[PDB]
Design a protein around this ligand. Structure first.
Ligand SMILES: Nc1ncnc2c1ncn2[C@@H]1O[C@H](COP(=O)(O)O)[C@@H](O)[C@H]1O
Ligand SMILES: Nc1ncnc2c1ncn2[C@@H]1O[C@H](COP(=O)(O)O)[C@@H](O)[C@H]1O
Ligand SMILES: Nc1ncnc2c1ncn2[C@@H]1O[C@H](COP(=O)(O)O)[C@@H](O)[C@H]1O
Ligand SMILES: Nc1ncnc2c1ncn2[C@@H]1O[C@H](COP(=O)(O)O)[C@@H](O)[C@H]1O
Lengths: 455, 454, 451, 452
């Protein structure tokens, strides 16, 4: 499916012609704009052992790098930019709206920037009345608060009606901020526009807090969601450690992927069990890990992605896991007397907020390069990040496959180093830990008796 | 330089891997590594896209860090030492905690020792103060700033220090510190080899400035940016609250501008960003200020501590503030009742617990450092490039300092948000008035309509 | 019904020792009991003579005393934390310990583990020695280093433990249940003629203590509640006809819901147990908000609407708002409802700076007054001063929002009313906005003429 | 205080001809028919008797509340707002709550924001004045500074009342310090002289919490929150060094309220230096050397107003002198380190704490209630947990300062180092307490280990 992917699948569509010079006065000289397309390897691992001659990629694939171009497709002073935000909100939405608007105006001096309201609905004939004019002063402070100043909706709309609106308002570039659904719909707008011979770029900024985009290592807002998940885990840990046989359960977003659950688990440094849809395990296996933790520890923290254990009945795995942990501890009152289970569901608090500084940097940079490349005629593509570089990826290939935790990858390996195992001798482990602690006590006893001898 | 060879990147291994990895953390024993895996130093292709697979611009391959099938040290007889040197940095306690817990929870090591107050803690007098790091001692240390071991800047006698490592039975010393510390670490490694003593010395790079070669990110850097942004928000609030207000923020960056540059973009409020890599004159700075003040009533200036050392080691924050005040006083006629507010957050950007993303990074660096030291790696540091954890010999890592690429992606992003001298500011304001009048008129129309149906 | 005798704070017999504190001259310790008025409102108009209280009642002020009941170098302090955790618990443990050691140089400080269970014969084995180095950093994280439990224990068994370990002062950190049990320990100790102060630090995040304006951790719970409301508002304002529902703690009182509502500055409806209103009245307020606004934020205390069918009012209110909006798709098309329950996140955290100050001060004065023989009482705050209140009166009556008080009045100024003409209001607001647009249009056409 | 009940009598514009239009309260009984009072000092003069207690002070302060009858006709009323002096956390919250109370409660005709302090009411400056409608203030509470802007300067009172007349302003809210409120009283009096119907009503802005007839000013608690952030950093630097010293300078030109509360709130302070308690260079170094007897780190908090006799930036000077002292004593304190943090404007140029947002909204809301009800020449303040009105004249006569015999300063001294206590005896007893812990732990561990 992913080994099915060819260099042609990664070839980024360009509208015909680059007839205008880049007006940007932001770089030192004109040599810092790009004459030609530069690439980066999809997989920078070598195929063979080190030789005398240079290394060769395991993969045939090259990803197009995003940068400001010498020659652009759209005449800046006649260009109108449209922005639309679709689906659930995500930290940094306002940062993206702000940076598209300011890059369009401060760098390219575009005629006009339009904000379509409440998702694709804003491009319907009735909805287009609500469209707002984004001037520089309108976006100055929007990055301080959560949500989208434009609003969102999950619905699709009639592509014919939507391209009617883009024509009527003279929109030459539409930036679609949304998930796979939105970008699939964006590609349909691009194709309807081409069919009518209308000069319109449609350019996607991927919005998925779950970080489940293929050809991508990081989507905007994900790191912020982890920051907030850690806040919920700290609370769960405080509840759990404050009880004799205390259990803290945190449910986090992750419908089909466990990236938030896994990173939050490691980042918290307090997680004992981490449950993700990629690693389905039974009720009985979970309770085994709990009873193992309780052998020589009096508290347990369980992180569960909302997508985990859908076969345990779209159902609330947080409530169900909490019931089953309570049921298990009640069945074993003799071993775990006066046990307590505390459940935390931070739900929307991890996505409905302003971004972390690192996410603000990322949002601004994604938005800025998106405008550079759309001005330079890029269409039917998304901007993404891989191996620390900003790349362009056609929507078709990006929306064909969902990314998921590699259970043999680096992150999941780190999760297993901090969580409880069934393999290791827990009695032997406690025996050695008592020795390490007695050695500390005895060195302290000695250093103290010494200090006390000199008063 | 471009005179770096594959041999410069070859990571030293102590002789023998006689023990199986005891780790019970992974699903099966196939998830440990039989052989050394590599990643390209430069994953850009040399030629245009062909029929055959792409080829690196660079000959160089960096060794990837991972848990190994076979390890050099007998876990239940192994003693780990930790020492923290130099200025503190967000995540120091996270690193101490993760070395300790990886050593104990994964490898079941005999003992973990924390040497106090840097290399001084391995001197004969200083070794009395060494503390026993058991699991219960490190449980909560990640909640607060600084180092539970303490630091010092000083070097010590390598002979005296290897005496201490022998006497206390230390098999692995983790050196958390800057180039100075890692150069000294390599000398400990070599003194140990000279005496035929079985000791790995393994570096965790500590530099908040993110100025490590063969590296894209050092621990604590992202946290320093988070705190720099806090100082810029304050500077902006002061500046925008005044008619012709100027906010000046000085940030760390002795020889590099990574913190200044990322904080500038991350704040989204910066107008001028001054870094040692791009020396410009007093007159050029005041030009950018006067340009900002053409059609704006506030200006925010970020300055790295290393910028403008030629302006007559010296506090560029205080000097830049004096000169901006002097310039605005000389021009009261154009800029009446101007205000200049100076913020130096200094140690507040490094003396704190890490961001979540830095906690993840610290724990992962520390964990892989223990895997690789157990597996016999010595005279090297762990680092991050292109989103992967790699090993790099200390010799090459300490030969050259990393610095902003003025033609790189970050510095390009800084210039998109900051003031330029090239663009017509009168034309720009003319067009912005048009865009704003169009907004006002569409709103005026939607309102006259809503009002007709009330 | 409360009399001056109900407020008389019990003192153990004798003050035979000088206060050893070298922190302050000796004139800054107190010779005699000082008081503050329960109600500092005047009975009569302003006169020639000084004003006179509406209330006969005087509350005893807390301060370090010249003469103390316990011999410091022979005194052992016990600490126990009971019930659900609360922001600043570790700050209180830390300040009791450091005041005991740094100020009074007490022999020993013992931390009983997991609530009153820690003073049972089996539980007392787990008791920990609180020396100065053990508490240095505990204020950086949430929960209690001692642990908690809800259970009571045999008072006879517990006073056995206090005798065996030589505990002279037990600090009981907990709610009314805990302090009622604390008073029983105090009385069992007196019955056996054993020299033991039992002194309460009130733990209730709900701020529902009588003879009190503020309990520790409450302001921190509000800080975290506001975080949940900001998220609810971001969800709601990002939707056409969006509704954000936040459930907050408040089993019997609405202090958190009310303060969070005002502090957020984003609340449209605030539902508290003190003001029971019907499903139909709530939906009336929603439909009123939606007349000329596209978002609504609803704060609901967990104790509100228990007659709507112990039950999760957050889930039930959310279902009913969804049901109401679905029944009215014609007026509110593509409406969305987002529910946030921050639950334990508002109590399982380190305190705000203002709560750290409060916790340290409560704990420090608690140690001063227990050393000075105070027993069977709690320390509390009224009218910006630290006071002592006997447990008996403090545990007789629960405090609840005054619907005619200053806070609830402020909640109603920011929330939607049924009384006002919404059409007239929108008419005038369009005028105010058009005046802004027209002045801006003029200032811009001018600036542009001189470019 | 030579202060009399007459000094506290709050001026009312003549007439209350309009009913309160507020539909926010359940019924009309929740508005106030008459002025209610609270005692300046609620401490009793005599011991508990049969009869009710009597105040030590003759003074009664007027309580702030929404009134049954108001002076200004709401639908013809224009509110002006001006922000003067250095910014302070919650400025935008105050602008927002004045605007929303004016519009949502009273349905006032118009709200005007004068820009860059009193300058905005000058004839040239009034061109820049902005229209505050409901939509303009929705989100301003999320960020620091003032959307109106500030300046320190006074202006011609004649010119300013000219502007208020021309624009039809009936209420001017003056957000600023004593300087601003003194100038506000002059506007009030110039308006009265011309027989023009104008309330001038002050919202006190001082982060230092140095207002008389007041226990808390808006933004103070937020400044403490941020000061603690600087102290945590200082402590991390200091504890990470052998003989480490962290020095934090905080605002406090004439008062030490921020320094004192930050010291206690941080729980990490060893020395706290405030202008109210001037002590010598030699006395400071005595406290440092005492801390270093049995501790390896010291945190020193210094208010900017401390040690003006030291012969100016007290932060830089104290740091130099501590370095000089430790260098003179290398033998006792080898490889010592001193780290200086000046958070300066970071403690005031930010959005408020939740508790300060509550306070700002409440101050602003009651300010509008009372100005609509004809109050003028006064400020709103908080004492003993209640909102009160205080004439500007008395409020601007005297500065408030730490009581060195008061409750807060006593709490500072409980946590800081003393010279009086036997440090050898103290360490002896602390080693005993720690050995008792070690021995109980050694026992519990040998036991657990015997049963595996
Ligand atoms: N290598 C590691 N890095 C970071 N956190 C870890 C690591 N190993 C374990 N942890 C976490 O740290 C906690 C230590 O507390 P405890 O398990 O009670 O000793 C464990 O519960 C894990 O949640
Ligand atoms: N492309 C961009 N992305 C992010 N921040 C930017 C960008 N362009 C400008 N900014 C910042 O946004 C601010 C907007 O304020 P103003 O220029 O006063 O409208 C500028 O001063 C910059 O600091
Ligand atoms: N006097 C006030 N003080 C503080 N917040 C208020 C006040 N009046 C209203 N609010 C809040 O501020 C919001 C203003 O935004 P909007 O209602 O959309 O105009 C209201 O919905 C209330 O939550
Ligand atoms: N009663 C108290 N309440 C709060 N903080 C205190 C108290 N006594 C001392 N402190 C602070 O707690 C710190 C404890 O660290 P140490 O002095 O090393 O034990 C002291 O340095 C003071 O800053």
């Amino acid at each position: 499916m992913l080994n099915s992917v060819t260099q042609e699948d990664l070839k980024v569509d360009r509208l015909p012609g680059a007839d205008y010079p880049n007006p940007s006065k932001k770089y030192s000289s004109r040599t810092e704009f790009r004459d030609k397309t530069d690439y980066i390897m999809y997989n920078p691992r070598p195929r063979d052992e080190p030789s005398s001659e240079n290394p060769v990629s395991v993969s045939p694939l090259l990803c197009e790098l995003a940068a400001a171009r010498s020659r652009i497709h759209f005449n800046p002073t006649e260009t109108t930019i449209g922005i639309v935000t679709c689906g659930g909100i995500c930290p940094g939405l306002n940062d993206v709206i702000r940076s598209i608007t300011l890059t369009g105006i401060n760098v390219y001096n575009v005629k006009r920037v339009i904000g379509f309201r409440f998702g694709y609905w804003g491009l319907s004939k009735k909805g287009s009345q609500t469209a707002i004019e984004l001037h520089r002063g309108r976006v100055t402070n929007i990055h301080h608060y959560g949500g989208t100043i434009l609003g969102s909706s999950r619905g699709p709309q009639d592509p014919k009606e939507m391209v009617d609106t883009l024509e009527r308002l003279g929109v030459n570039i539409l930036f679609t901020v949304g998930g796979d659904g939105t970008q699939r719909g964006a590609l349909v707008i691009s194709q309807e526009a081409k069919r009518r011979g209308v000069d319109i770029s449609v350019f996607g900024v991927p919005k998925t807090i779950d970080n489940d985009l293929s050809f991508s290592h990081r989507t905007f807002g994900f790191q912020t969601a982890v920051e907030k998940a850690v806040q919920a885990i700290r609370a769960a840990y405080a509840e759990a450690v404050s009880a004799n046989y205390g259990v803290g359960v945190v449910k986090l977003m992750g419908r089909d992927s466990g990236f938030i659950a896994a990173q939050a688990a490691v980042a918290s440094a307090q997680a004992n069990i981490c449950l993700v849809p990629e690693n389905p395990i039974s009720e009985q296996e979970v309770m085994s890990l709990l009873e193992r933790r309780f052998c020589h520890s009096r508290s347990c923290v369980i992180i569960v992605a909302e997508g985990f254990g859908q076969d345990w009945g779209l159902i609330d795995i947080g409530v169900i896991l909490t019931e089953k942990v309570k049921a298990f501890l009640k069945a074993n009152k003799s071993r775990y007397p006066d046990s307590t289970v505390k459940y935390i569901d931070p739900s929307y608090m991890i996505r409905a907020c302003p971004p972390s500084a690192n996410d603000a940097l990322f949002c601004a940079t994604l938005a800025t390069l998106a405008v550079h490349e759309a001005m330079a005629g890029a269409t039917g593509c998304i901007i993404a990040m891989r191996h620390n570089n900003y790349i362009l990826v056609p929507i078709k290939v990006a929306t064909s496959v969902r990314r998921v935790l590699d259970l043999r990858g680096q992150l999941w390996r780190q999760v297993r180093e901090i969580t409880v195992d069934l393999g290791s001798d827990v009695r032997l482990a406690r025996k050695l830990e008592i020795r390490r602690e007695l050695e500390a006590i005895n060195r302290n006893r000695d250093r103290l008796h010494e200090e006390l001898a000199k008063l």
